Amino acid sequence: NKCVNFNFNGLTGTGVLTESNKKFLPFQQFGRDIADTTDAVRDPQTLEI
């Protein structure tokens, strides 16, 4: 809930992280919206999307 510069397993970006209702598959790390812009990320430590 804050503008944060984040780095998730080499994926670097800026933005606010919020709880998500999206359900990722076990083998999927991050999800891209249309146009291949990062939209969601699974934090590897606790596998929270």
Partner: protein, 270 residues
Amino acid sequence: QCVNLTTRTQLPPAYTNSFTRGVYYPDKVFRSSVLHSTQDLFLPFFSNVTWFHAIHVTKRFDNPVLPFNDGVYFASTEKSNIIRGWIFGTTLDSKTQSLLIVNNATNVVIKVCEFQFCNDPFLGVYYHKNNKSWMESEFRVYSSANNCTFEYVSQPFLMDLEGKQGNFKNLREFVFKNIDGYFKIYSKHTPINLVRDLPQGFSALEPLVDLPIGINITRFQTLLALHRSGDSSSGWTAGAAAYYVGYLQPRTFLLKYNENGTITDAVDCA
């Protein structure tokens, strides 16, 4: 020690048609409700794949030495876990570094080692009439192995090994690729109710492992179990089993994802 089995009838080769098979996730990037174009090594739709059979009825024991051009799609319609693993290399005689992936009765072995692979690698299961029980008895693949770097052994389990009767039930689809010095294995697996064919339909393979081996693979062979309960080269049964081999080529495919991340339809542009 190895023995080259005899009592094996020679037939031509056979071939079959693969209907929209050999599709995996090209990348590890989750996409949901999207129509993605991707260029990569795929198995073309409505392709012809080499058919190898293992039937009791001859005994049709197929385990030839197949090339490995740029990747292989390997499907297996099995009932009693006859196919056990694979071997990949260049010369297979410990001159050059080979790879083997085996699934014996207890463990899953993955070695990248300098094996002196013999002409007829296989495994042998022994069946006891005194008390009906099947379990691995013989492991004839490889003679010697001196220099090697990469091993992996999985936590011991207990495996069926028993020979059922009926039609094939389990479809095992596997994709092997060797690129950037990475051996990439995609796998997936599906209950079937056919008798003799390799189903139609769609199913996207998901990646299973990425071995960082970086060897030079040009040929490979499958290795599958035989049943015993004759001589050293005659006393063995095959067991119902079939497996299909295809040969990946660089293609554009236009994949469809669901509202999920799972690939629910693809089309070959060429």
